């Protein structure tokens, strides 16, 4: 219904910290919920949680800059994601017309499935070891600081970066792109034969590869 | 100069850190010393109210503005208002750069000044990530150690809420193991990088008292003991500087390097001395451009007029140049100046021989036409012939400034024409 997120909202302002705002917060899901507004920001307010009940018809969910542990069950209708520099650990299924994930400087440490709509998506700043397939229109990739240990296989414009990993393994599904990937990989410590064994295969007629930046 | 309206100094945009080049006009025009605070905090701290209270007054583009306006406590220094504006803002654009934003915030401003809202939690230090990267950041000398040699003061500011909690407020706890290691990063930096540290307080505006006078203590702090942005040892930074150095960061981000703190004054000092070439190459083109009016009497003149003012120009090096280590400007300065001699010689013995030439011309066509047509065969012309051309020849040098090759020439006449005064005196 509508009056029994009330009840649940109300019942989080009395479980909080001293310094956790929550008044504000009660009062903004109570300013998107009766206005059938699309967009819900959380921005500052030091939360350690969420409540249970999120609106469900928002499509903009911003509950970034917190100590969160643990997100909410996000409601279907949502697709933009912005929940970067709290605490998590790990992310809740997301949403099937998801179109944007932006959770940085958390300490997730697996992702779980990834819809065909994400277009953009930002994972730096955290402790992954592997990673789904990304899909097929997953644009912009940022995981610029975990444990990554090998490269992740696209289901085939596109420009990941993974900056600052673990990985040091190039197969042959990064050499069978076209010249429009862009894959960043330094900082990453390689292998010894595949460091110049780029060098010379990039010294190549290498328009049916993609570009390496290490 | 005069800003009404701050405009952005580097823009953050389409994944990269670029400059503006309308708003780099603007420092290069500004040529007076320059005290440099930057207001560095989350994306809506409320940014804007320390810049318009301290310059003085009273939806956007991401990354570093600046404003400019007089100093209002000092004379001929010239305080620069830079600001953060959309810094950490997710939602908006990239965050790749945040943490260049800081760096470059650090090596540009005289006194960076951090704007957090929290009580200095460990929230608010999990909010200030950009500082555990600044030994992976910036460079000092093409390591981590002479940082507080250019590093400016810290100024936090804490908007809801003196020094007394700071002092101790970063006395990070003893310790191995990793649990507390993360903790010391960020208070380890804050304490040893930053020579003068500082914190200030401000009362919320709603529901002012404690408040208007509470900032004006804090913008009277800033205005009193700001001090002038310095380099490697004085060297006031003025505008055309700032422009140098913010060229020379930005095109090291977008480029792979480091912003290097030695590289960046090198090449300011070689480009400052590029100017001092170009400074007294004009004042050598001025002074020998009237001084010297060929073809000339002698060459030692000429040599003295040179030996003269190429010492005279080297002066105007000197009076506006510094850092010519290894003497390399003072000798291309040297080696076109000997080049302009070596062409100035041989200009003049052309000029010489073009004068001679005509004034050869000039003179003797005359004879040339009236022996030409047969005056000078009657039997008597012969020592008419001597008189003329004898007085002639009178006629020839009494004529100022022939240039060093003047007779030279002129034998080449006489040598080569008296086949005539052969005939002359054969038909006497």
Known sequence: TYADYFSAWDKWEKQALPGEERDEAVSRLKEC???N????????????????????????????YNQLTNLPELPVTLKKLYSASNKLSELPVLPPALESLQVQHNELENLPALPDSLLTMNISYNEIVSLPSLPQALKNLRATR????????????????????????????????????????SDNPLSSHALPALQRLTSSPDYHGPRIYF | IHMTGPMCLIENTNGRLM?????????????????VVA???????????????????????????????????????????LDTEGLGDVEKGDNQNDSWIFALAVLLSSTFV???????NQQAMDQLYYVTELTHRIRSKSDSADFVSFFPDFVWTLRDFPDEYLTYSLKLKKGTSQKDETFNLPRLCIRKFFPKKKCFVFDRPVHDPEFVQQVADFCSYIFSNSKTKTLSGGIQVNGPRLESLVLTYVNAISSGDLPCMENAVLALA????????????????????????????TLQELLDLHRDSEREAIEVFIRSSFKDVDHLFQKELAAQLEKKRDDFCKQNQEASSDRCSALLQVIFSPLEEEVKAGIYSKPGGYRLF???????????????????????????????????????????
Request: glycine letters at 4%; one cysteine or more; charged letters at 20%.
């Open chain 1, 146 to 185: 975990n444990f990554l240990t090998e490269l992740p296989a696209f289901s085939e414009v596109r420009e990941y970066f993974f900056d600052r990993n673990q990985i040091s393994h190039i197969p042959e599904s990064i050499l069978n792109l076209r010249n429009e990937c862009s894959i960043h990989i």
């Open chain 2, 114 to 120: 951090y704007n957090s809202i929290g009580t200095i």
């Open chain 1, 33 to 35: 919920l009766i206005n």
């Open chain 2, 270 to 297: 070689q480009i400052e001395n590029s100017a001092a070439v170009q400074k007294a190459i004009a004042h050598y083109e001025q002074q020998m451009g009237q001084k010297v009016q060929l073809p000339t009497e």
């Open chain 2, 39 to 81: 207001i560095v905090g989350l994306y809506r701290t409320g940014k804007s109210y320390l810049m318009n209270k301290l310059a003085g007054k009273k939806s956007h583009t991401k990354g570093i503005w600046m404003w400019c306006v007089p100093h209002p406590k000092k004379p001929g220094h010239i305080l620069v208002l």
């Open chain 2, 386 to 428: 001597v008189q003329k051309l004898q007085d002639l020849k009178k006629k020839y040098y009494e004529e100022p400034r022939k240039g060093i090759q003047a007779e030279e020439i002129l034998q080449t006449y006489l040598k080569s024409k008296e086949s005539m005064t052969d005939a002359i005196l054969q038909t006497d």
């Open chain 2, 19 to 35: 400059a503006n080049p309308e708003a780099l006009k603007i420092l290069s025009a500004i040529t007076q010393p320059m005290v």
């Open chain 1, 37 to 64: 507004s699309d967009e819900l920001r959380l921005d500052r307010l030091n939360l350690s949680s969420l409540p249970d009940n999120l609106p469900a018809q928002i499509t903009l969910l911003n509950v970034s």
